[PDB]
């Protein structure tokens, strides 16, 4: 069961968007 309301998921698309946010600084 979902004991944590704030439980969410993370995948490769989060990585790419983050590496992009860093290149643009």
């Amino acid at each position: 069961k979902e004991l944590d309301k704030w439980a969410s998921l993370w995948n490769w698309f989060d990585i790419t968007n983050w590496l992009w946010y860093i290149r643009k600084k």
Partner: antibody, heavy 132, light 110 residues
């Protein structure tokens, strides 16, 4: 163990509509990008559409020959990928494959943000025949 | 307009042979290439992704290499379980095209 159960394929007349479904299991459906790929017997493979996680927008992309007629959607609560096909045409006759996709992030600095998109797991396919 | 041409479109070979399928590209796509296998009675299967990365589960016999506009797929020690058709797929187009090559049928030499 991962499997992609496809259904909803069969016979249909030109100009008709049909909805394909792909019930998944063995992985986190809500965290995975999905695509449809079709193959006309005698020809090669042709990417149809893709849909991302709901939280990502979702981001949806269609191939040119189907844009305006096909609609890709997903139901996370039931782990089902859909493809609503409208105004079907004889050119649409093909085997339609369900796919679970992944993205390989590019680690080169000037390519940070870009990724290689590939089809990780394919379903066994479903036949759609357009005939009068 | 990004095209992919595989060479050969069909060539023969016997069990325990070394084959090299080539995927020529109209434009430089770096390492945004992937390889798939498809047998008419089963679902297609991913072999190599991002030019030369082996997907987990595929045997070490399959190998991919190349960078730019030309690539290769090598299958050392051809096994009978892999007489099938192979496709290369690109993901470099800013427009999500995901073009596939025409395919390469691996036949039993005779």
């Amino acid at each position: 163990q991962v499997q992609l159960v496809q259904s909803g394929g069969g016979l249909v007349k030109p100009g008709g509509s049909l909805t394909l479904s792909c019930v998944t299991s063995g992985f986190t459906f809500s965290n995975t990008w999905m695509s449809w790929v079709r193959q006309t017997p005698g020809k090669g493979l042709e990417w149809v559409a893709r849909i991302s996680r709901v939280g990502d927008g979702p981001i949806i992309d269609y191939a040119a020959p189907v844009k305006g007629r096909f609609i890709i959607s997903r139901d996370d609560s039931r782990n089902t990928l859909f493809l609503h096909m409208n105004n079907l045409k004889t050119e649409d006759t093909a085997v339609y494959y369900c796919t679970a996709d992944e993205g390989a992030p590019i680690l080169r600095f000037f390519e940070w943000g870009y990724y290689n998109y590939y089809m990780d797991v394919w379903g066994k396919g479903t036949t759609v025949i357009v005939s009068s | 307009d990004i095209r992919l041409t595989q060479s050969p479109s069909s060539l023969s070979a016997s069990v325990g042979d070394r084959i090299t399928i080539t995927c020529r590209a109209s434009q430089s796509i770096k390492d945004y290439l992937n390889w798939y296998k498809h047998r008419p009675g089963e679902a297609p299967k991913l072999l190599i992704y991002s030019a030369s990365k082996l997907r987990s589960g595929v045997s070490s016999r399959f190998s991919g290499s190349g960078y730019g506009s030309a690539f290769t797929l090598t299958i050392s020690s051809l096994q009978p379980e892999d007489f099938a058709t192979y496709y290369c797929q690109e993901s470099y187009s800013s427009v999500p095209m995901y073009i596939f090559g025409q395919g390469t049928k691996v036949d039993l030499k005779r």
